[PDB]
C-alpha cells in the first residue's frame, strides 16, 4: 500500500501532513511527498525521510477559482505533470492537505481513478479544498462548518504537547500571579506586541507574562515593558519550548490560527483569543468550538482594547481558569492523527 | 431562462429531452439543444422548433471507462467545443438525459461553474452518467438502483397514452375472450415473433391477440399463425396509434425498453415483461419495480417458454387482472416531465 501526500507553502498544511504520514509509515505504508521546491516543503520533508517529487505551479498561486473558471490552461501543465508523477508512482491513495500544490495533484489523481481524500484544518475551507473537494472520495474538517457534510476529526498535535499532563495535574493547588502566556502566531502579532505591555501596566503585581513578539521585536517589545514599569516580565521573539511553555501557563492571549487552537485545547489551557482581523472571519470560526464549550473568550478587533483585555484577565480567577483548562481538554480531538490515517485507510481498503 | 440539454442520438434520450423541452419553453425558458449531426438528433430536435449547436465526438465514442482513464486527451477537443458553445450561449442550467454528448458538454458546464442536472431512464446507468455523475449538481432517475440514491421521478411519458382514461373505467364490464397485446419494442423482437403463435396454438379461443412483427415481419409472423389454426389474429409492423392499442388491451407480452414500461404503468395495464436478453440486463431492472408491486410479471428469454406464457396468460382471470390494472397505475409517476422540469427550475435559481 503506497501513499502521496500533497501538501506544501506552510506548516500549516506540512505539519498536519507529515504527522500523518509518520503514523502510516509505521504502519508499513509507503509514503512520497507532491511539494514544489521553491517552497518549505523542499527543505523539511527531506529531514523527515520521505522522498518527495516536485512540480511547477507559476501562474497558479494566488487563483480566487473565478480565474481557474476564467483559464483553464493555467492548471493543464501541473496537471500534467503530476499524471506523470503517480503514473511513476501508482498511489493507491493521495491524501491532500490543502495548498495550491493540492490542485493538480487532485485533479490528477482523479483523473487517473486514484481516491482522493482531503482535511481541511481551519474554519474557512482555503483555496484550492474549496474547488477540489468536489472531485473528492471523502472529506474531514478540523473543526465545524468548514465544509457542510464533512466529518470533524479536528488537527492532528505536535507530539509534545499531546505529552502534557491534564489540567488537574498541572493546575494542582498553584498559586500566585496569573501567569499569562502571549503568543502571536510563529511570526507575532504586533497587535499583542503593543497592547499587552500597557495590559500590564493596568494589571501590575497581578501577573507574571511570558511573551512572544517574534523575530525583530524582542528588543521592542522589552523596552515597553520597562516604561509600563513592568521590566520583570520575559520577552522572546520565538519559542522553541512551546510545550512548556503551555504547562507553565495559567490562561493564552493569542492569535488563534488553526494550529495553535487545537494545541490549546490539547493542552487544557484557558484562551481569550484575539482573532486576526479579515473578512472571512477564518480566525474567529477556528477559536468558536473552545468559546462554544466554555473553554475561552474571543475578542474580534471591534471590542478590542487594552481594558476590555484587562478587565476579561482581572476577572479569572484560579477556580474558573482550572474549570476553563478542563473543559478545553473536553473539548479536544488529541487522537487526530490517528482519526485520518484510519480514514486513509479506510478509502485505502476499496 | 435559458437552458441548454444535452440528449444524445437515440430516442429513449431525446424523446424525454424534448418532453422537458417543451415544457420549459411554455413556462418562458430560451432553449438550447447539444448533439451530434451523424445522428438522430440531427433532424428531430430542429423539427420540434428548437436550436441545436452540433460537437464533434467522433473519437470519443466507443472507447469505454478505462479507455478514457488512458486517454484523457481524448475528450479534449469536445470539451473545447462544449465549453465554447456554453460561452456563446451562456447557459443557466444545462440537462443532461445520457447520450455521449453529455459528457463533454457537462464537463464544460462544469469547468465554467454552470449547475448541471443529470436524468437516467433505466434501471441501469450508462457510460456517460455513470461517472458524469460525480460532478453533477442533481440527479435523477426513472427507476430504483441505477445511482446509489438518486431522487426517482420516472421517465416522461408520451401524452397521447397520459390522455387515456384509467384502468377502472375501460376494463371493468369487459365480457369475452382476453385481449392480448404482443409489443416487441420498437423494432419487433424475434423470439416474440416465433413463440406467440405457438401460446395461440394452446389458448384458441379464449384471447384474441394483436401482434406487433416488427418492420420487414408481418408476412412471416402472420403465416406462423395460420400453422397454429389461428388465422384471425391480427399482425402490424408497427402500431402507429399506441395509445388505442394500450387502450383496446386487457394484458400486454412485450420488451422492457424504458419507455415502453413508463407507458404500461400510466396506462394501467397488466404486463408479461420478456426483457431483452443482455449482459447489463438492463430491461430486466426496468421491468422489476412494476413486479415488485405485482402489476406484472417478468420472465428472461432463459425462462421463456411457450408454456410458461400459456399458462402465466392463463392463470390470469378477467377480475385479477383489473386489479393487476390498478396497481400498474398505482405505481406509476404520470407528472415526470413536470417533476424533472421543476427540478431543472429549482437549481437554475441561485
Ligand atoms: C496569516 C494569519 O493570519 N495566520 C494564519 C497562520 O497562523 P500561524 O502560522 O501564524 O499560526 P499557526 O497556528 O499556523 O501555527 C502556530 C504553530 O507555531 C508554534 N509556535 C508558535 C509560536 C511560538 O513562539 N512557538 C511555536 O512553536 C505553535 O505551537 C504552532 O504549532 O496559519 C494558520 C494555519 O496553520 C492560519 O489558521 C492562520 O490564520
Ligand atoms: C433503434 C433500436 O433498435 N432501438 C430503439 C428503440 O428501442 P426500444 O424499442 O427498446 O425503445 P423502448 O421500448 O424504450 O420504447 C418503445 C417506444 O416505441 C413505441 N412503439 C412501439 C411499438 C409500436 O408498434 N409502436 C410504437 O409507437 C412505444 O409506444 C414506445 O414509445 O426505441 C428507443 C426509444 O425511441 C431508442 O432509443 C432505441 O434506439
Same mark, same amino acid.
Given at each position: 500500500?503506497?501513499?502521496?501526500?500533497?501538501?506544501?507553502?506552510?506548516?500549516?498544511?506540512?505539519?498536519?501532513?507529515?504527522?500523518?504520514?509518520?503514523?502510516?509509515?509505521?504502519?508499513?505504508?509507503?509514503?512520497?511527498?507532491?511539494?514544489?521546491?521553491?517552497?518549505?516543503?523542499?527543505?523539511?520533508?527531506?529531514?523527515?525521510?520521505?522522498?518527495?517529487?516536485?512540480?511547477?505551479?507559476?501562474?497558479?498561486?494566488?487563483?480566487?477559482?473565478?480565474?481557474?473558471?476564467?483559464?483553464?490552461?493555467?492548471?493543464?501543465?501541473?496537471?500534467?505533470?503530476?499524471?506523470?508523477?503517480?503514473?511513476?508512482?501508482?498511489?493507491?491513495?493521495?491524501?491532500?492537505?490543502?495548498?495550491?500544490?493540492?490542485?493538480?495533484?487532485?485533479?490528477?489523481?482523479?483523473?487517473?481513478?486514484?481516491?482522493?481524500?482531503?482535511?481541511?484544518?481551519?474554519?474557512?475551507?482555503?483555496?484550492?479544498?474549496?474547488?477540489?473537494?468536489?472531485?473528492?472520495?471523502?472529506?474531514?474538517?478540523?473543526?465545524?462548518?468548514?465544509?457542510?457534510?464533512?466529518?470533524?476529526?479536528?488537527?492532528?498535535?505536535?507530539?509534545?504537547?499531546?505529552?502534557?499532563?491534564?489540567?488537574?495535574?498541572?493546575?494542582?493547588?498553584?498559586?500566585?500571579?496569573?501567569?499569562?502566556?502571549?503568543?502571536?502566531?510563529?511570526?507575532?502579532?504586533?497587535?499583542?506586541?503593543?497592547?499587552?505591555?500597557?495590559?500590564?501596566?493596568?494589571?501590575?503585581?497581578?501577573?507574571?507574562?511570558?511573551?512572544?513578539?517574534?523575530?525583530?521585536?524582542?528588543?521592542?517589545?522589552?523596552?515597553?515593558?520597562?516604561?509600563?514599569?513592568?521590566?520583570?516580565?520575559?520577552?522572546?521573539?520565538?519559542?522553541?519550548?512551546?510545550?512548556? /511553555?503551555? %504547562?507553565?501557563?495559567?490562561?493564552?492571549?493569542? @492569535?488563534?490560527?488553526? *494550529? !495553535?487552537?487545537? #494545541?490549546? $485545547?490539547? &493542552?487544557?489551557?484557558?484562551?481569550?483569543?484575539?482573532?486576526?482581523?479579515?473578512?472571512?472571519?477564518?480566525?474567529?470560526?477556528?477559536?468558536?468550538?473552545?468559546?462554544?464549550?466554555?473553554?475561552?473568550?474571543?475578542?474580534?478587533?471591534?471590542?478590542?482594547?487594552?481594558? /476590555?483585555? %484587562?478587565?476579561?484577565?482581572?476577572?479569572?480567577? @484560579?477556580?474558573?481558569? *482550572? !474549570?476553563?483548562? #478542563?473543559? $478545553?481538554? &473536553?473539548?479536544?480531538?488529541?487522537?487526530?492523527?490517528?482519526?485520518?490515517?484510519?480514514?486513509?485507510?479506510?478509502?485505502?481498503?476499496?
Amino acid at each position: 500500500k503506497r501513499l502521496m501526500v500533497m501538501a506544501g507553502g506552510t506548516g500549516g498544511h506540512v505539519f498536519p501532513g507529515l504527522a500523518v504520514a509518520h503514523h502510516l509509515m509505521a504502519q508499513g505504508w509507503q509514503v512520497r511527498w507532491l511539494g514544489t521546491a521553491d517552497r518549505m516543503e523542499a527543505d523539511l520533508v527531506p529531514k523527515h525521510g520521505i522522498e518527495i517529487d516536485f512540480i511547477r505551479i507559476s501562474g497558479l498561486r494566488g487563483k480566487g477559482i473565478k480565474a481557474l473558471i476564467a483559464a483553464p490552461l493555467r492548471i493543464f501543465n501541473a496537471w500534467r505533470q503530476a499524471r506523470a508523477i503517480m503514473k511513476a508512482y501508482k498511489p493507491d491513495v493521495v491524501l491532500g492537505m490543502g495548498g495550491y500544490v493540492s490542485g493538480p495533484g487532485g485533479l490528477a489523481a482523479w483523473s487517473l481513478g486514484i481516491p482522493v481524500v482531503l482535511h481541511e484544518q481551519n474554519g474557512i475551507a482555503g483555496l484550492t479544498n474549496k474547488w477540489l473537494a468536489k472531485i473528492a472520495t471523502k472529506v474531514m474538517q478540523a473543526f465545524p462548518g468548514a465544509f457542510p457534510n464533512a466529518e470533524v476529526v479536528g488537527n492532528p498535535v505536535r507530539t509534545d504537547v499531546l505529552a502534557l499532563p491534564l489540567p488537574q495535574q498541572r493546575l494542582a493547588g498553584r498559586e500566585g500571579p496569573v501567569r499569562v502566556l502571549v503568543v502571536g502566531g510563529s511570526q507575532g502579532a504586533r497587535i499583542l506586541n503593543q497592547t499587552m505591555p500597557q495590559v500590564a501596566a493596568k494589571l501590575g503585581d497581578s501577573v507574571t507574562i511570558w511573551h512572544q513578539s517574534g523575530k525583530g521585536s524582542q528588543q521592542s517589545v522589552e523596552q515597553a515593558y520597562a516604561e509600563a514599569g513592568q521590566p520583570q516580565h520575559k520577552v522572546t521573539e520565538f519559542i522553541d519550548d512551546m510545550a512548556a /511553555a503551555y %504547562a507553565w501557563a495559567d490562561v493564552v492571549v493569542c @492569535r488563534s490560527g488553526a *494550529l !495553535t487552537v487545537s #494545541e490549546i $485545547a490539547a &493542552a487544557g489551557l484557558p484562551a481569550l483569543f484575539v482573532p486576526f482581523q479579515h473578512k472571512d472571519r477564518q480566525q474567529y470560526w477556528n477559536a468558536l468550538p473552545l468559546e462554544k464549550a466554555g473553554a475561552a473568550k474571543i475578542i474580534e478587533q471591534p471590542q478590542l482594547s487594552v481594558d /476590555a483585555v %484587562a478587565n476579561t484577565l482581572a476577572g479569572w480567577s @484560579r477556580e474558573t481558569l *482550572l !474549570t476553563m483548562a #478542563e473543559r $478545553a481538554r &473536553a473539548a479536544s480531538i488529541p487522537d487526530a492523527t490517528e482519526r485520518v490515517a484510519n480514514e486513509v485507510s479506510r478509502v485505502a481498503r476499496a
